[PDB]
A paper describes a structure:
CD8+ T cell activation is driven by the recognition of human leukocyte antigen class I molecules (HLA-I) on the surface of infected cells. Viral peptides are loaded onto the HLA within the cell, and this step required a stable peptide HLA (pHLA) complex. The stable pHLA complexes are then transported to the surface where they can be displayed to CD8+ T cells, recognised via their T cell receptor (TCR). Our work focuses on HLA-B*18:01 that is expressed in around 2.3% of the world’s population, spanning various continents.
We then solved the X-ray crystal structure for the HLA-B*18:01-PB1177-B complex at a resolution of 2.0 Å. PB1177-B adopts a canonical conformation within the binding cleft, consistent with HLA-I binding. The P4-Thr, P6-Phe, P7-Ser and P8-Val side chains were solvent exposed, forming a large surface for potential TCR contacts. Strikingly, there was high flexibility of the peptide central region, from P5-Phe to P7-Ser, as reflected by the weak electron density for the two residues. The melting temperature of the HLA-B*18:01-PB1177-B complex was ~49°C. The ensemble refinement for PB1177-B also shows the large flexibility of P6-Phe, which can ‘shield’ P3-Met and P4-Thr, which could potentially limit TCR interaction.
Numbering used by the authors:
A (entry chain A): 1 to 276
B (entry chain C): 1 to 9
C (entry chain B): 1 to 100
The structure:
């Protein structure tokens, strides 16, 4: 299928408590593989998946230098943003950025990304053309003017079409035993009485990877989206994910309800009913 | 590897 | 500031089998800003060996963290997750319910 590599950068000011913390985490699809944290006793890029551990010293040192540099750039960014919004020196603020590439089944670039947000609001983003910017407000237009003069989009484009796609393809190969393995969900329907009149049917999906799944309840074949409690997909802790969906049904109408599960790891989409 | 972000905001 | 209050799910890695070892999870998501305090509780007391994931965030910029610890369920013991965040007037406690 399609694949992506993404980096998630969080920088948080903390006036009175040192300089802004900078953390970068890298993902291939749903699999975290690196971290850097300026608050570690010895900040360095560190492996967080087994397959990346075979990269050599020069990979780790190059990434560590990049993240120490990015640490300084985000701290200067945070000072500038404070000026752009006329904000006091006394408050804590957050600067986030996510960037990376998506590739198709044939390894070709599908699209690149480079988005930033300030205090939780979209601030500036590289457009899909990888050549122009969308600024959210007059503050971000100042950033846009700086980045146009410094030709940041051209340099981002080079990274995204070159390094990012090449290294995503390398990681996918080195980690193929996990990254290119879809694990299907283990599924069950549980039944939880509420009262004499109603009961909860809960459809479980456990242990699956990647996180993408469709888990739906139908009544006489009509989707029950409006009456379904669908919890957010949640990490199990072992790289896999979990999800469930529940509907409240009239007592004795259980068999009119079917749970349908679609996941890349299943040989066939699943149709589940309550088996008492 | 990561990208070094060419400018402060 | 945009501020977003956390969602909290408390659950086990594997379906719970009284007496069989397992992992207790507290997954906090959808919140902003990133400062948050999370404790895993056993019979109202704070568990000491609790690991957590590296801070990351979703497509809508909201943060998420997974706190976890090894544990062995039993009929008498009650586990919970206690979360504090600037958006909450008091720390929220969520009890582990093995059917959720
Ligand atoms: Na600071
Ligand atoms: Na290493
Ligand atoms: Na700031
Ligand atoms: Na932000």
């Amino acid at each position: 299928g399609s694949h992506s590599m993404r980096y998630f950068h969080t920088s948080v000011s903390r006036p009175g408590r040192g300089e802004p913390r900078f953390i970068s985490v890298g993902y291939v699809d749903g699999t975290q593989f690196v971290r850097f944290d300026s608050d570690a006793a010895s900040p360095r890029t560190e492996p967080r998946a087994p397959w990346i551990e075979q990269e050599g010293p020069e990979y780790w040192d190059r990434n560590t230098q990049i993240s120490k540099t990015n640490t300084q750039t985000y701290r200067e960014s945070l000072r500038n943003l404070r000026g752009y919004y006329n904000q006091s020196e006394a408050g804590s603020h957050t600067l986030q950025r996510m960037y990376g590439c998506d590739v198709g089944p044939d390894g070709r670039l599908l699209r690149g990304h480079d988005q930033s947000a300030y205090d939780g609001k979209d601030y500036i983003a590289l457009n899909e053309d990888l050549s122009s910017w969308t600024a959210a407000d007059t503050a971000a237009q100042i950033t846009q003017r700086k980045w146009e003069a410094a030709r940041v989009a051209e340099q981002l484009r080079a990274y995204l079409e070159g390094t990012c796609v090449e290294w995503l393809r390398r990681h996918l190969e080195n980690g193929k035993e996990t990254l290119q393995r879809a694990d299907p969900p283990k599924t069950h329907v549980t039944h939880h009485p509420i009262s004499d009149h109603e009961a909860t049917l809960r459809c479980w999906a456990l242990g699956f990877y990647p996180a993408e799944i469709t888990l739906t309840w139908q009544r006489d074949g009509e989707d029950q989206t409006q009456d379904t409690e669908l919890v957010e997909t949640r990490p199990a802790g072992d790289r896999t994910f979990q999800k469930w969906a529940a509907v409240v049904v009239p007592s004795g109408e259980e068999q009119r309800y079917t749970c349908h599960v679609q996941h890349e790891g299943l040989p066939k989409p699943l149709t589940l009913r309550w088996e008492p | 590897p990561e990208m070094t972000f060419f400018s402060v905001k | 500031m945009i501020q977003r209050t956390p969602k909290i799910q408390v659950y086990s890695r594997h379906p719970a089998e009284n007496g069989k070892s397992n992992f207790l999870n507290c997954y906090v998501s959808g919140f902003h800003p990133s400062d948050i305090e999370v404790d895993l509780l056993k019979n109202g007391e704070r568990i000491e060996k609790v690991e957590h994931s590296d801070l990351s965030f979703s497509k809508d910029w909201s943060f998420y963290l997974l706190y976890y610890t090894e544990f062995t369920p039993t009929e008498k013991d009650e586990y919970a997750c206690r979360v504090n965040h600037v958006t909450l007037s008091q720390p929220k406690i969520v009890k582990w319910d093995r059917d959720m």
